[PDB]
Design a protein around this ligand. Structure first.
Ligand SMILES: CC[C@H]1OC(=O)[C@H](C)[C@@H](O[C@H]2C[C@@](C)(OC)[C@@H](O)[C@H](C)O2)[C@H](C)[C@@H](O[C@@H]2O[C@H](C)C[C@H](N(C)C)[C@H]2O)[C@](C)(O)C[C@@H](C)C(=O)[C@H](C)[C@@H](O)[C@]1(C)O
Ligand SMILES: [Mg+2]
Ligand SMILES: [Mg+2]
Ligand SMILES: [Mg+2]
Ligand SMILES: [Mg+2]
Ligand SMILES: [Mg+2]
Ligand SMILES: [Mg+2]
Ligand SMILES: [Mg+2]
Ligand SMILES: [Mg+2]
Ligand SMILES: [Mg+2]
Ligand SMILES: [Mg+2]
Ligand SMILES: [Mg+2]
Ligand SMILES: [Mg+2]
Ligand SMILES: [Mg+2]
Ligand SMILES: [Mg+2]
Ligand SMILES: [Mg+2]
Ligand SMILES: [Mg+2]
Ligand SMILES: [Mg+2]
Ligand SMILES: [Mg+2]
Ligand SMILES: [Mg+2]
Ligand SMILES: [Mg+2]
Ligand SMILES: [Mg+2]
Ligand SMILES: [Mg+2]
Ligand SMILES: [Mg+2]
Ligand SMILES: [Mg+2]
Ligand SMILES: [Mg+2]
Ligand SMILES: [Mg+2]
Ligand SMILES: [Mg+2]
Ligand SMILES: [Mg+2]
Ligand SMILES: [Mg+2]
Ligand SMILES: [Mg+2]
Ligand SMILES: [Mg+2]
Ligand SMILES: [Mg+2]
Ligand SMILES: [Mg+2]
Ligand SMILES: [Mg+2]
Ligand SMILES: [Mg+2]
Ligand SMILES: [Mg+2]
Ligand SMILES: [Mg+2]
Ligand SMILES: [Mg+2]
Ligand SMILES: [Mg+2]
Ligand SMILES: [Mg+2]
Ligand SMILES: [Mg+2]
Ligand SMILES: [Mg+2]
Ligand SMILES: [Mg+2]
Ligand SMILES: [Mg+2]
Ligand SMILES: [Mg+2]
Ligand SMILES: [Mg+2]
Ligand SMILES: [Mg+2]
Ligand SMILES: [Mg+2]
Ligand SMILES: [Mg+2]
Ligand SMILES: [Mg+2]
Ligand SMILES: [Mg+2]
Ligand SMILES: [Mg+2]
Ligand SMILES: [Mg+2]
Ligand SMILES: [Mg+2]
Ligand SMILES: [Mg+2]
Ligand SMILES: [Mg+2]
Ligand SMILES: [Mg+2]
Ligand SMILES: [Mg+2]
Ligand SMILES: [Mg+2]
Ligand SMILES: [Mg+2]
Ligand SMILES: [Mg+2]
Ligand SMILES: [Mg+2]
Ligand SMILES: [Mg+2]
Ligand SMILES: [Mg+2]
Ligand SMILES: [Mg+2]
Ligand SMILES: [Mg+2]
Ligand SMILES: [Mg+2]
Ligand SMILES: [Mg+2]
Ligand SMILES: [Mg+2]
Ligand SMILES: [Mg+2]
Ligand SMILES: [Mg+2]
Ligand SMILES: [Mg+2]
Ligand SMILES: [Mg+2]
Ligand SMILES: [Mg+2]
Ligand SMILES: [Mg+2]
Ligand SMILES: [Mg+2]
Ligand SMILES: [Mg+2]
Ligand SMILES: [Mg+2]
Ligand SMILES: [Mg+2]
Ligand SMILES: [Mg+2]
Ligand SMILES: [Mg+2]
Ligand SMILES: [Mg+2]
Ligand SMILES: [Mg+2]
Ligand SMILES: [Mg+2]
Ligand SMILES: [Mg+2]
Ligand SMILES: [Mg+2]
Ligand SMILES: [Mg+2]
Ligand SMILES: [Mg+2]
Ligand SMILES: [Mg+2]
Ligand SMILES: [Mg+2]
Ligand SMILES: [Mg+2]
Ligand SMILES: [Mg+2]
Ligand SMILES: [Mg+2]
Ligand SMILES: [Mg+2]
Ligand SMILES: [Mg+2]
Ligand SMILES: [Mg+2]
Ligand SMILES: [Mg+2]
Ligand SMILES: [Mg+2]
Ligand SMILES: [Mg+2]
Ligand SMILES: [Mg+2]
Ligand SMILES: [Mg+2]
Ligand SMILES: [Mg+2]
Ligand SMILES: [Mg+2]
Ligand SMILES: [Mg+2]
Ligand SMILES: [Mg+2]
Ligand SMILES: [Mg+2]
Ligand SMILES: [Mg+2]
Ligand SMILES: [Mg+2]
Ligand SMILES: [Mg+2]
Ligand SMILES: [Mg+2]
Ligand SMILES: [Mg+2]
Ligand SMILES: [Mg+2]
Ligand SMILES: [Mg+2]
Ligand SMILES: [Mg+2]
Ligand SMILES: [Mg+2]
Ligand SMILES: [Mg+2]
Ligand SMILES: [Mg+2]
Ligand SMILES: [Mg+2]
Ligand SMILES: [Mg+2]
Ligand SMILES: [Mg+2]
Ligand SMILES: [Mg+2]
Ligand SMILES: [Mg+2]
Ligand SMILES: [Mg+2]
Ligand SMILES: [Mg+2]
Ligand SMILES: [Mg+2]
Ligand SMILES: [Mg+2]
Ligand SMILES: [Mg+2]
Ligand SMILES: [Mg+2]
Ligand SMILES: [Mg+2]
Ligand SMILES: [Mg+2]
Ligand SMILES: [Mg+2]
Ligand SMILES: [Mg+2]
Ligand SMILES: [Mg+2]
Ligand SMILES: [Mg+2]
Ligand SMILES: [Mg+2]
Ligand SMILES: [Mg+2]
Ligand SMILES: [Mg+2]
Ligand SMILES: [Mg+2]
Ligand SMILES: [Mg+2]
Ligand SMILES: [Mg+2]
Ligand SMILES: [Mg+2]
Ligand SMILES: [Mg+2]
Ligand SMILES: [Mg+2]
Ligand SMILES: [Mg+2]
Ligand SMILES: [Mg+2]
Ligand SMILES: [Mg+2]
Ligand SMILES: [Mg+2]
Ligand SMILES: [Mg+2]
Ligand SMILES: [Mg+2]
Ligand SMILES: [Mg+2]
Ligand SMILES: [Mg+2]
Ligand SMILES: [Mg+2]
Ligand SMILES: [Mg+2]
Ligand SMILES: [Mg+2]
Ligand SMILES: [Mg+2]
Ligand SMILES: [Mg+2]
Ligand SMILES: [Mg+2]
Ligand SMILES: [Mg+2]
Ligand SMILES: [Mg+2]
Ligand SMILES: [Mg+2]
Ligand SMILES: [Mg+2]
Ligand SMILES: [Mg+2]
Ligand SMILES: [Mg+2]
Ligand SMILES: [Mg+2]
Ligand SMILES: [Mg+2]
Ligand SMILES: [Mg+2]
Ligand SMILES: [Mg+2]
Ligand SMILES: [Mg+2]
Ligand SMILES: [Mg+2]
Ligand SMILES: [Mg+2]
Ligand SMILES: [Mg+2]
Ligand SMILES: [Mg+2]
Ligand SMILES: [Mg+2]
Ligand SMILES: [Mg+2]
Ligand SMILES: [Mg+2]
Ligand SMILES: [Mg+2]
Ligand SMILES: [Mg+2]
Ligand SMILES: [Mg+2]
Ligand SMILES: [Mg+2]
Ligand SMILES: [Mg+2]
Ligand SMILES: [Mg+2]
Ligand SMILES: [Mg+2]
Ligand SMILES: [Mg+2]
Ligand SMILES: [Mg+2]
Ligand SMILES: [Mg+2]
Ligand SMILES: [Mg+2]
Ligand SMILES: [Mg+2]
Ligand SMILES: [Mg+2]
Ligand SMILES: [Mg+2]
Ligand SMILES: [Mg+2]
Ligand SMILES: [Mg+2]
Ligand SMILES: [Mg+2]
Ligand SMILES: [Mg+2]
Ligand SMILES: [Mg+2]
Ligand SMILES: [Mg+2]
Ligand SMILES: [Mg+2]
Ligand SMILES: [Mg+2]
Ligand SMILES: [Mg+2]
Ligand SMILES: [Mg+2]
Ligand SMILES: [Mg+2]
Ligand SMILES: [Mg+2]
Ligand SMILES: [Mg+2]
Ligand SMILES: [Mg+2]
Ligand SMILES: [Mg+2]
Ligand SMILES: [Mg+2]
Ligand SMILES: [Mg+2]
Ligand SMILES: [Mg+2]
Ligand SMILES: [Mg+2]
Ligand SMILES: [Mg+2]
Ligand SMILES: [Mg+2]
Ligand SMILES: [Mg+2]
Ligand SMILES: [Mg+2]
Ligand SMILES: [Mg+2]
Ligand SMILES: [Mg+2]
Ligand SMILES: [Mg+2]
Ligand SMILES: [Mg+2]
Ligand SMILES: [Mg+2]
Ligand SMILES: [Mg+2]
Ligand SMILES: [Mg+2]
Ligand SMILES: [Mg+2]
Ligand SMILES: [Mg+2]
Ligand SMILES: [Mg+2]
Ligand SMILES: [Mg+2]
Ligand SMILES: [Mg+2]
Ligand SMILES: [Mg+2]
Ligand SMILES: [Mg+2]
Ligand SMILES: [Mg+2]
Ligand SMILES: [Mg+2]
Ligand SMILES: [Mg+2]
Ligand SMILES: [Mg+2]
Ligand SMILES: [Mg+2]
Ligand SMILES: [Mg+2]
Ligand SMILES: [Mg+2]
Ligand SMILES: [Mg+2]
Ligand SMILES: [Mg+2]
Ligand SMILES: [Mg+2]
Ligand SMILES: [Mg+2]
Ligand SMILES: [Mg+2]
Ligand SMILES: [Mg+2]
Ligand SMILES: [Mg+2]
Ligand SMILES: [Mg+2]
Ligand SMILES: [Mg+2]
Ligand SMILES: [Mg+2]
Ligand SMILES: [Mg+2]
Ligand SMILES: [Mg+2]
Ligand SMILES: [Mg+2]
Ligand SMILES: [Mg+2]
Ligand SMILES: [Mg+2]
Ligand SMILES: [Mg+2]
Lengths: 275, 48
RNA sequence: GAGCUAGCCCUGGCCAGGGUGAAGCUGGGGUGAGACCCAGUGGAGGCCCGAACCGGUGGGGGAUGCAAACCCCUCGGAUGA
RNA sequence: GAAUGCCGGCAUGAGUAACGAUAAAGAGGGUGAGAAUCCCUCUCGCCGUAAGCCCAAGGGUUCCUACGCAAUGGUCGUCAGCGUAGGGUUAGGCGGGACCUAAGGUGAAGCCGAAAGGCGUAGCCGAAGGGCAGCCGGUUAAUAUUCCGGCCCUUCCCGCAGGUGCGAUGGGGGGACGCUCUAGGCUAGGGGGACCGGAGCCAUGGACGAGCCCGGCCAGAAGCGCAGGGUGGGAGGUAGGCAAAUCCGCCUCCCAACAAGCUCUGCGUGGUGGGGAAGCCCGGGUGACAACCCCCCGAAGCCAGGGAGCCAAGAAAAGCCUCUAAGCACAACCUGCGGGAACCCGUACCGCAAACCGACACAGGUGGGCGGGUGCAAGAGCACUCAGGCGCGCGGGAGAACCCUCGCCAAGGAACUCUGCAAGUUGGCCCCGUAACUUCGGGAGAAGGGGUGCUCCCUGGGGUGAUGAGCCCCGGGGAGCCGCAGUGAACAGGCUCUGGCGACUGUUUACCAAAAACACAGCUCUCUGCGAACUCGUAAGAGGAGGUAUAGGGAGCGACGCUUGCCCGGUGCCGGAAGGUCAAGGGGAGGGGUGCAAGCCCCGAACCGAAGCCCCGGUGAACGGCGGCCGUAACUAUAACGGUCCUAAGGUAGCGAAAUUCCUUGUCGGGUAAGUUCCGACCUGCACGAAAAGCGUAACGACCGGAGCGCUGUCUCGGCGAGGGACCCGGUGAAAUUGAACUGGCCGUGAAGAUGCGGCCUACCCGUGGCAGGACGAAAAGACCCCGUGGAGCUUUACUGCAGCC
RNA sequence: CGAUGUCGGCUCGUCGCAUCCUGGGGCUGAAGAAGGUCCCAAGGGUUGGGCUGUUCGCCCAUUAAAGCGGCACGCGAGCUG
RNA sequence: UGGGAGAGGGUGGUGGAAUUCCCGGAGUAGCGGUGAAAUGCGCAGAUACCGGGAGGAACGCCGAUGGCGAAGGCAGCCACCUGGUCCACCCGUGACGCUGAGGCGCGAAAGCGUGGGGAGCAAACCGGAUUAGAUACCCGGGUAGUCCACGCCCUAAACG
RNA sequence: CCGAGGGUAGGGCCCGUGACUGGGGCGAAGUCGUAACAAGGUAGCUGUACCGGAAGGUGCGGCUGGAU
């Protein structure tokens, strides 16, 4: 439920923020958090290997549980639901009757104080983790493992999901958030339901500084640079691209596919993406 | 205005000091050369 | 060689005073319930005025200078990128 | 003898410019060979959110004392941050270490790279972050939370007693956190007192007074008092916290619940130790048995880890508490008391500056805290002052031009000029009032005006206190007084109308451009299924991201509104197992060299044979492109209509002499007495146009235009005045430049612009203050231009190659 | 080319005369007045404005008239920019 | 009070045909399209045939001169939340009624905003053909839209 | 004190006029086409959307004031 403001500043005209109504706890679990190193897009060599990054809000990284087969058959209770700044999605705190506490990501409609579970015999119920094969065909599902027991990889960001089209042997046919049809092992754990906070994309950042809060440093076009800096640099006055539109490093950025065409996982990709 | 020299004893020793030279191959050859020329001091003096 | 300078990282510090009065909350009206209206409370904001601080618009001086970029008068930002 | 040669010495300009903020000086008395310059007093001026005081960087004896003045000091010097010598820095409690972690650094394991070396989990290092136990006064010429005095606390060792399952680098808790706003109650600090203590003082017309002047506190252990913080107690189950675990986490039950109890903080008091003014007198002595009280203001600091709300969601680790594991329970741990033990390093001095950074005793730069009073609405603003500190290391005169900084101005009022450039104007507070337009916020402090002091009387409400007084904070009414003037000084918008460009706040060419440029939220295209794409790297490894398509890279555009048309022939990209072209490799028809021969050796066609190209499509918010001629209407004119060649397709809406229009000051209209600019239109648009976006857009702008009002020294057109210079005198004393010079005008001549040649003319010798026409004046071996088979940056369907990718 | 600063403006002039005005003349298709044209004459004079960087030019209002040229398109060790 | 009909409205589900697209099988020289034809698609293996797969939309027969709503309008099928209405009985209140300026609400299509979605259809646009021309009628493509959610628009041959 | 009115500043409504621009009405015999009345030669009309020299064409839904 995105929030509008009255236009009492030039930048409050369109700026929108999340509702935070599904939030029930306003501080993290001191046991499930750890320091988060702001890299600033600079690798171990020190050099900027991802441009235009840095200077955002300090955050604490909450440990998220992407391998839910760790605790099979132990009913955890949905303790609270908390803001996580390292994600688009929200996170739910779970109190396993084991006594262990864990953060999962909150699917849609999941309510505080409900029992969730994981395992082959789990119910098909929002928030439960079964191997892919044991989920009935035709059910939206988030937090999918790609390869078995390597971690939940697909369908994680806000509002995303993944449908199961059918089965075919040791593999199921998943329709990814991007409309791709990939085959994923049936023994791959997944969580039933779409990720919550779907209203996330409607957020209008509203002003430049808000992007600066998020660690996004200003982007400078190539057409504004000099030939020493960019294919698009130079020109007297303005100038069209004057060549195939290109990145700073030379390769063409309009249409040029870059997926490796000998990659092994191609054997498991039925159909490249939609739209 | 703010000139370029802004002395900082910790900066001085950790950049041009003896132990910073002996670590790298170049800084060793710096020491060899100055020890060959006959310099009185091979490293910048700073009273710490 | 990043003790100048550009950015980023970690850890601290700094921003007189005054103005405007957002949502919300309360009460009243309203309605089938509402939207909503009004009032008070409230104290939002790359909000407004203006020191420190950060700047450097216009003019004058300076031009073997006080100074290898300075001085005076004006002027911009000043809870924020 | 010449290389704008090299090194050095000495000249010239020259007794010239200058002697470093215009805060400012004067006299007396000392000292001494010598005094504007040092010492002392008196008087005057300057800073006072500093030009004062206290930390930290950095500097490194510059600190104090004696003795000096060659040089350093822009003059002088007896003086000094200068020379010579002597002296000076005292810690269990301040800061750092023997404690902890942060980025980063390093790095057993492990990984990688010709070598060198590069990484890398732990671990280690790393601080202005965490943790941690001293406050006040006195003393030295110079150090003091360090020596001393008073009253306090910490650790380690050993011991006695009491108590307990003791026990850790292991498990747990805690440490532990953001921005904005903010409650209660304190203190820091300050204002007043008619209360208390005090050397005194009565002036010059009055006052011997509730007169004036001065001061009226600081530190403190246990206990107690006020104000807050922290925190439930019990038991049952227990599979989780990588062994265990009575702790922690989860579940049930019991009672406690806004409390209370306990624990810890701050503030108050407190045994006690201190401090203690002006004035007078020679830092000290007095004062003085000094007094040490009451009321008020009151923090941004304390209680503190308080409270609220918000989104962008806010270090770590140790100390400390708890749980237990080996081990051990003659030990070991907790508590209380006693005795003993307690190391290394810093401590002088400067510190918005004459000691730091600027080659200088350089108007510049330099992080943190304290920063007193009154008035002006507030305040760290502004003026004046306390404490404190200064008068800026050349002076004395004179009273020209001219320069700077400043004041005023008759009539005019932008006529100045590229331009109101500059300088006026306006100026804060309260009340009245306030337009088109708009995104309903705004535009807006729109505009325009009224008020403002001092005295008297009447009065409303608040804070404290107690409900009163008293101080204190907001006011309201009536009547008066004075001046030219009542924010009477200082600090403090000129306004309006209309265009262009960019939505906006923001960013930029450090040192000529702050803009219309960059950025920006927002729209689109494209890429990317995660060991992602992409980037850095030889690699390992990093980033991306401990992210997962509502996500990440790249690119164009640039809030918002209404919109973005036609062309796929070329170029890019994407799709296409056919076809054709194609490399090594396969095949080996068929020949060749040799040899007695077996054989060895070489050439070798058809055919099989990738990617890439060819070829078939697609595709524009991919690179891009979007015609010409001829004719036609019942007045002329112009062509809705036709005709034809060409195209891949012939510019759509909307705009338009425009940041674009050459002809151009286009033509018409407005504004003006007059308008190459400006605004509105027209349209044969040299040469607009739709995300290198098209047409609008409220708001915004130190952007660029036009106009008007107000007001002016901008001007007609200049005058006077002030101070700092120029000028004269004493002191100190540069510079660039310079072939040598005994260095006139005209008219000619000359390498074509002559002080230097010819002819004529003029002219006694040397200066000083001035002005700049010349010495093709100085400065920089022309930046333009050319030249060189000179250089470099950038580009591409130039050549060639390399990485990368296929 | 081991540098001769480049338009215009301002300031300050100075010279030429092929004279815009003032003075003197002849001819006139000169009645007067007022014009045309030529001759003599450089003594003095030769305005203030709107527009544009402009010189120039147009325009407003005057005027006796609103002259044309040279002086390195006179003059940046005189200013402006 | 007890009963009844119905595509009335809203929500949530779900079922079969059909077309398009993708995959396999089989198969070969044309399919398509019209007044005729050309475009277009097909030896790179189309069309016609079988199986599998995904997806959207719409509900054949019943079906009617039918039924409901105040109108716009409403049609597979099941369930839930819900309106209107009629009939029996003659039980209850006792004129409590009718109309309705303003007000408020509803209001087909198309269109607009933000999201999703997209099979068929199809303004715009492209091409073939017709034609003097053909910015058309015919044919082959084709974008918005048509669908969903929410939020506007509020017009109509909104008619009996 | 009030006060005619004078002055300054900003509003509101009306009238007249304005380069140019928008359609409108009219006008004996203009140019282009043929949309409509017959099934008007694509049944018409409609609200809307979009396009086009022009009448109009088409998508969507609606009406019969539509023919056999
Ligand atoms: C402040 C102090 C500086 O003076 C200036 O800036 C003036 C204002 C320059 O004009 C500036 C400004 C400007 C507009 O001059 C009017 C322009 O000409 C150029 C850009 O230089 C001068 C004089 C230039 O001379 C000019 O050289 C020109 C190439 C041609 C001309 N010559 C023919 C005579 C001559 O005057 C030139 C080169 O800078 C001189 C050289 C030696 C310098 O660099 C010297 C050291 C200067 O930096 C300076 C003296 O310190
Ligand atoms: Mg909003
Ligand atoms: Mg609003
Ligand atoms: Mg939420
Ligand atoms: Mg932790
Ligand atoms: Mg990271
Ligand atoms: Mg590293
Ligand atoms: Mg990058
Ligand atoms: Mg970056
Ligand atoms: Mg995310
Ligand atoms: Mg979240
Ligand atoms: Mg798999
Ligand atoms: Mg967005
Ligand atoms: Mg961004
Ligand atoms: Mg962030
Ligand atoms: Mg950009
Ligand atoms: Mg550029
Ligand atoms: Mg550029
Ligand atoms: Mg570079
Ligand atoms: Mg390049
Ligand atoms: Mg380019
Ligand atoms: Mg450019
Ligand atoms: Mg260009
Ligand atoms: Mg450019
Ligand atoms: Mg640009
Ligand atoms: Mg382009
Ligand atoms: Mg181009
Ligand atoms: Mg390219
Ligand atoms: Mg690449
Ligand atoms: Mg895909
Ligand atoms: Mg600097
Ligand atoms: Mg520094
Ligand atoms: Mg240091
Ligand atoms: Mg350092
Ligand atoms: Mg180093
Ligand atoms: Mg070192
Ligand atoms: Mg080596
Ligand atoms: Mg070695
Ligand atoms: Mg030696
Ligand atoms: Mg060295
Ligand atoms: Mg630096
Ligand atoms: Mg501030
Ligand atoms: Mg402020
Ligand atoms: Mg105010
Ligand atoms: Mg609230
Ligand atoms: Mg505020
Ligand atoms: Mg301001
Ligand atoms: Mg300046
Ligand atoms: Mg600066
Ligand atoms: Mg200079
Ligand atoms: Mg200055
Ligand atoms: Mg100033
Ligand atoms: Mg300022
Ligand atoms: Mg010689
Ligand atoms: Mg030489
Ligand atoms: Mg030499
Ligand atoms: Mg020499
Ligand atoms: Mg000499
Ligand atoms: Mg000599
Ligand atoms: Mg001399
Ligand atoms: Mg001289
Ligand atoms: Mg000088
Ligand atoms: Mg001086
Ligand atoms: Mg000064
Ligand atoms: Mg003296
Ligand atoms: Mg002397
Ligand atoms: Mg003295
Ligand atoms: Mg003060
Ligand atoms: Mg030094
Ligand atoms: Mg001396
Ligand atoms: Mg001397
Ligand atoms: Mg002497
Ligand atoms: Mg001596
Ligand atoms: Mg000096
Ligand atoms: Mg002496
Ligand atoms: Mg030791
Ligand atoms: Mg450590
Ligand atoms: Mg290393
Ligand atoms: Mg280190
Ligand atoms: Mg520390
Ligand atoms: Mg300590
Ligand atoms: Mg002390
Ligand atoms: Mg103490
Ligand atoms: Mg004992
Ligand atoms: Mg115990
Ligand atoms: Mg124990
Ligand atoms: Mg422990
Ligand atoms: Mg934390
Ligand atoms: Mg901290
Ligand atoms: Mg915040
Ligand atoms: Mg408080
Ligand atoms: Mg105290
Ligand atoms: Mg006070
Ligand atoms: Mg006494
Ligand atoms: Mg007397
Ligand atoms: Mg257990
Ligand atoms: Mg005594
Ligand atoms: Mg503070
Ligand atoms: Mg605190
Ligand atoms: Mg750590
Ligand atoms: Mg024993
Ligand atoms: Mg030791
Ligand atoms: Mg010691
Ligand atoms: Mg000391
Ligand atoms: Mg200063
Ligand atoms: Mg300071
Ligand atoms: Mg000093
Ligand atoms: Mg210097
Ligand atoms: Mg230096
Ligand atoms: Mg000095
Ligand atoms: Mg200084
Ligand atoms: Mg004081
Ligand atoms: Mg006083
Ligand atoms: Mg004030
Ligand atoms: Mg003093
Ligand atoms: Mg004189
Ligand atoms: Mg004299
Ligand atoms: Mg001054
Ligand atoms: Mg005055
Ligand atoms: Mg005047
Ligand atoms: Mg006037
Ligand atoms: Mg003017
Ligand atoms: Mg003038
Ligand atoms: Mg200008
Ligand atoms: Mg003024
Ligand atoms: Mg108006
Ligand atoms: Mg208004
Ligand atoms: Mg206006
Ligand atoms: Mg407007
Ligand atoms: Mg409004
Ligand atoms: Mg204001
Ligand atoms: Mg106002
Ligand atoms: Mg006003
Ligand atoms: Mg009054
Ligand atoms: Mg008075
Ligand atoms: Mg003022
Ligand atoms: Mg102001
Ligand atoms: Mg214009
Ligand atoms: Mg710009
Ligand atoms: Mg801007
Ligand atoms: Mg714009
Ligand atoms: Mg805009
Ligand atoms: Mg700002
Ligand atoms: Mg820039
Ligand atoms: Mg610059
Ligand atoms: Mg520059
Ligand atoms: Mg520079
Ligand atoms: Mg430079
Ligand atoms: Mg400048
Ligand atoms: Mg610029
Ligand atoms: Mg600016
Ligand atoms: Mg922008
Ligand atoms: Mg947009
Ligand atoms: Mg998009
Ligand atoms: Mg990571
Ligand atoms: Mg991106
Ligand atoms: Mg924009
Ligand atoms: Mg609009
Ligand atoms: Mg093309
Ligand atoms: Mg093509
Ligand atoms: Mg193409
Ligand atoms: Mg074939
Ligand atoms: Mg091939
Ligand atoms: Mg386009
Ligand atoms: Mg092109
Ligand atoms: Mg082309
Ligand atoms: Mg005819
Ligand atoms: Mg269009
Ligand atoms: Mg035009
Ligand atoms: Mg014009
Ligand atoms: Mg235009
Ligand atoms: Mg043009
Ligand atoms: Mg023109
Ligand atoms: Mg004209
Ligand atoms: Mg006119
Ligand atoms: Mg115009
Ligand atoms: Mg024309
Ligand atoms: Mg253009
Ligand atoms: Mg374009
Ligand atoms: Mg363009
Ligand atoms: Mg605009
Ligand atoms: Mg700006
Ligand atoms: Mg600006
Ligand atoms: Mg102007
Ligand atoms: Mg004006
Ligand atoms: Mg004016
Ligand atoms: Mg003057
Ligand atoms: Mg004077
Ligand atoms: Mg004399
Ligand atoms: Mg002398
Ligand atoms: Mg001297
Ligand atoms: Mg001679
Ligand atoms: Mg002579
Ligand atoms: Mg000649
Ligand atoms: Mg000559
Ligand atoms: Mg001569
Ligand atoms: Mg001769
Ligand atoms: Mg001669
Ligand atoms: Mg002279
Ligand atoms: Mg001269
Ligand atoms: Mg001159
Ligand atoms: Mg000269
Ligand atoms: Mg010369
Ligand atoms: Mg000269
Ligand atoms: Mg010269
Ligand atoms: Mg020279
Ligand atoms: Mg040169
Ligand atoms: Mg040279
Ligand atoms: Mg040369
Ligand atoms: Mg040349
Ligand atoms: Mg050469
Ligand atoms: Mg050559
Ligand atoms: Mg050549
Ligand atoms: Mg060359
Ligand atoms: Mg080169
Ligand atoms: Mg190579
Ligand atoms: Mg030359
Ligand atoms: Mg020379
Ligand atoms: Mg005459
Ligand atoms: Mg006559
Ligand atoms: Mg006559
Ligand atoms: Mg004659
Ligand atoms: Mg004359
Ligand atoms: Mg004139
Ligand atoms: Mg002119
Ligand atoms: Mg002209
Ligand atoms: Mg006359
Ligand atoms: Mg002339
Ligand atoms: Mg000449
Ligand atoms: Mg000249
Ligand atoms: Mg000339
Ligand atoms: Mg010329
Ligand atoms: Mg000239
Ligand atoms: Mg000049
Ligand atoms: Mg000039
Ligand atoms: Mg000149
Ligand atoms: Mg074929
Ligand atoms: Mg589909
Ligand atoms: Mg009855
Ligand atoms: Mg009714
Ligand atoms: Mg519809
Ligand atoms: Mg066609
Ligand atoms: Mg035909
Ligand atoms: Mg079709
Ligand atoms: Mg409707
Ligand atoms: Mg009908
Ligand atoms: Mg009158
Ligand atoms: Mg017809
Ligand atoms: Mg027909
Ligand atoms: Mg059509």
């Amino acid at each position: 439920a995105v929030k509008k403001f009255k236009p009492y500043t030039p930048s409050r005209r369109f700026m929108t923020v999340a509702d935070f109504s599904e939030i029930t706890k306003t501080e993290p679990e001191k046991s499930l958090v750890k320091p988060l190193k702001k890299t600033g897009g600079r690798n171990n060599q020190g050099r900027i290997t991802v441009r235009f990054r840095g200077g955002g809000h300090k955050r604490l990284y909450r440990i998220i549980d992407f391998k839910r087969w760790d605790k099979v058959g132990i009913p955890a209770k949905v303790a609270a639901i908390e803001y996580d700044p390292n994600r688009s999605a929200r996170i739910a705190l779970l109190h396993y009757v084991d006594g262990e506490k864990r953060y999962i990501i909150a699917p849609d409609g999941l309510q505080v104080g409900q029992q969730v579970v994981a395992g082959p015999d789990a119910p098909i119920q929002v928030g439960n983790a079964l191997p892919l094969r044991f989920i009935p065909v035709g059910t939206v599902v988030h937090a999918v493992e790609l390869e078995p027991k390597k971690g939940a990889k697909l369908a994680r960001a806000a509002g995303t999901s993944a449908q199961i089209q059918g089965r075919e042997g040791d593999y199921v046919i998943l329709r990814l958030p991007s409309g791709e049809l990939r085959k994923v092992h049936g023994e791959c754990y997944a969580t039933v339901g779409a990720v919550g906070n779907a209203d996330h994309k409607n957020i209008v950042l509203g002003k430049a500084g808000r992007s600066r809060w998020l660690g996004r440093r200003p982007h400078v076009r190539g057409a504004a640079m000099n030939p020493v800096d960019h294919p698009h640099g130079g020109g007297e006055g303005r100038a069209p691209r004057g060549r195939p539109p290109a990145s700073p490093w030379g390769w063409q950025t309009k249409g040029l596919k870059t997926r490796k065409r000998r990659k092994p996982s191609s054997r498991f990709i039925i159909a490249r993406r939609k739209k | 205005m703010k000139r370029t020299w802004q002395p900082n004893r910790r900066k001085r020793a950790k950049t041009h000091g003896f132990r910073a030279r002996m670590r790298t191959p170049g800084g060793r050859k710096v020491l060899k050369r100055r020890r060959q020329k006959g310099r009185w001091r091979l490293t910048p003096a700073v009273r710490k």
